[PDB]
Design a protein around this ligand. Structure first.
Ligand SMILES: [K+]
Ligand SMILES: [K+]
Ligand SMILES: [K+]
Ligand SMILES: [K+]
Length: 480
């Protein structure tokens, strides 16, 4: 009934490989719904390079933990039946399901094939640095165990255009298959960033184009998805992702939300991509991700007035999926840029209580990351989810008018009981700030939902109130 949306990435990189994650999801549905979560982004649910694979070393997109391939029936998360049981539970609890989609490459080929290739400059793929010669690449996929269920398409080297490993001479190099082009258009870092890892798919082939379109539709119908989380799209030809997206929305009755991961600390690059997509999807606010990181790393000298400066939610709050961290940014991972405990609460309040952006809660922060002795922040986040779910409504007023202390308010809406809130925080010494919260809320007494401050704020006749916060902390006052 107008309820704010809150997405949750239900997994972290160091989750246990006990194949019980789908069951946890099923049992957690109700609690998650009650807490304020409206959508769940599940990890790649298909068979990867191995059982313990997080999902990105995707082997067979049609095996959702149902066939004995790559040394296991189930995936790291569980069986196909448990995943469907989980999804059903989420649905009955009014939670949308977004599937993670990996179409950039494939890994775990069943066998190798002789292929004429050329070495290219790692920092500039447009440039070859060797003559063409035959290498043995892992490009043959037969999916033994699936027995052609759902599809009989088989992958071969001619469906790809590159790999980073030659089994013949057993060496690592970035190989571009001779007489094949890098995809385009794609991100231009390193000249051409078509190749990332594994066996890189060449979308110029109409047969590839159709297979992934057909697969996408089969996947969407099989799990009854409500959207997707498009993986490593800055490496995938832009025109194709666009094509693919349009194709799925055409085949599916239900609406489909789409958020793509274009990983670049550059809002312009992201805007350029959204232009090419005709703004038909949202993108994770990566610059914002790094804003939080820079602020976490720098400390009190960071000017809080520029916290949203350069973000995506700032420029196009309607096409931005905001978050603080994920499986790639947690300690030790490839895109590490972890927001420390002291700042994480400020970051979360910033994406959960403001009107712009679609906020996403990270499983790792919510339940903690045991592997790294990172505590569960459930308590701190639930309070903010309560703020977002019941108080972050109505007209917004911002106050990024000081380097340490900044805040904003939401007047609330007639449609919702006691909604309305005032957020204030400082990444340096504490302080206070007079902010407007709507003359219609005059005479109310607001208290801090987080409990980081006991101050009791009464709204005066003109709709104003003075809010407080201690150093390096955040408060969210509401009429409770
Ligand atoms: K690519
Ligand atoms: K981060
Ligand atoms: K500061
Ligand atoms: K605290």
């Amino acid at each position: 009934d107008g309820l704010n949306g809150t997405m949750m990435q239900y997994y972290e990189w160091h989750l246990e490989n006990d194949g019980q994650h789908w069951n946890r999801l099923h049992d957690d549905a109700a609690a998650l719904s009650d807490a304020g979560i409206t959508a769940i982004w599940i990890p790649p649910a298909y068979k990867g390079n191995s059982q313990a694979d997080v999902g990105y070393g995707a082997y067979d997109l049609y095996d959702l933990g149902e066939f004995n391939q790559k040394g296991t029936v189930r995936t790291k998360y569980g069986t196909k039946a448990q995943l469907e049981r989980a999804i059903g539970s989420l649905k009955s609890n009014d939670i949308n399901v977004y599937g993670d989609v990996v179409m950039n490459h494939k890994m775990g080929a069943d066998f190798t094939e002789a292929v004429q290739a050329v070495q290219v400059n790692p920092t500039n793929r447009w440039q070859d640095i060797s003559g063409a010669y035959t290498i043995d690449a892992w490009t043959g996929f037969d999916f033994s165990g699936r027995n052609n269920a759902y599809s009989d398409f088989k992958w071969r080297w001619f469906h790809f255009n590159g790999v980073d490993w030659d089994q013949r001479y057993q060496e690592n190099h970035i190989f571009r298959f001779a007489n094949t082009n890098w995809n385009w258009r794609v991100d231009e870092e390193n000249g051409n960033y078509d190749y990332l890892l594994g066996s890189n798919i060449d979308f110029s082939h109409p047969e590839v184009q159709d297979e992934l379109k057909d697969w996408g539709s089969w996947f969407t119908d099989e799990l009854d998805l409500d959207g997707y989380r498009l993986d490593a799209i800055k490496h995938i030809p832009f025109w194709y992702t666009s094509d693919w997206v349009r194709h799925q929305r055409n085949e599916a009755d239900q609406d489909l939300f789409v958020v793509g991961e274009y990983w670049k600390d550059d809002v312009g690059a992201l805007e350029f991509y959204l232009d090419e997509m005709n703004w038909e999807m949202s993108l994770f606010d990566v610059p914002l991700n790094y804003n939080f990181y820079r602020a976490s790393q720098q400390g009190g000298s960071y000017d809080m007035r520029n916290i949203l400066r350069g973000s995506l939610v700032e420029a196009h709050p309607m096409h931005a999926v905001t978050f603080v961290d994920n499986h790639d940014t947690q300690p030790g991972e490839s895109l590490e840029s972890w927001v420390a405990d002291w700042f994480k609460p400020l970051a979360y309040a910033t994406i959960l209580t403001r009107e712009g952006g679609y906020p996403n809660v990270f499983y790792g922060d919510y339940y903690g990351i045991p592997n790294d002795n990172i505590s569960a922040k459930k308590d701190m986040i639930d309070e903010l989810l309560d703020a977002r779910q019941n108080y972050a409504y109505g007209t917004q007023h911002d106050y990024f008018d000081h380097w340490d202390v900044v805040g904003w308010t939401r007047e609330g809406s007639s449609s919702r009981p006691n909604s309305g809130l005032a957020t204030i925080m400082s990444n340096g010494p504490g302080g206070s700030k007079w902010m407007y919260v709507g003359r219609q809320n005059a005479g109310q007494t607001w208290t801090d939902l987080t409990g980081n401050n006991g101050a009791s704020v009464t709204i005066n006749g003109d709709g104003w109130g003075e809010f407080f916060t201690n150093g390096g902390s955040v408060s969210v006052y509401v009429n409770q």
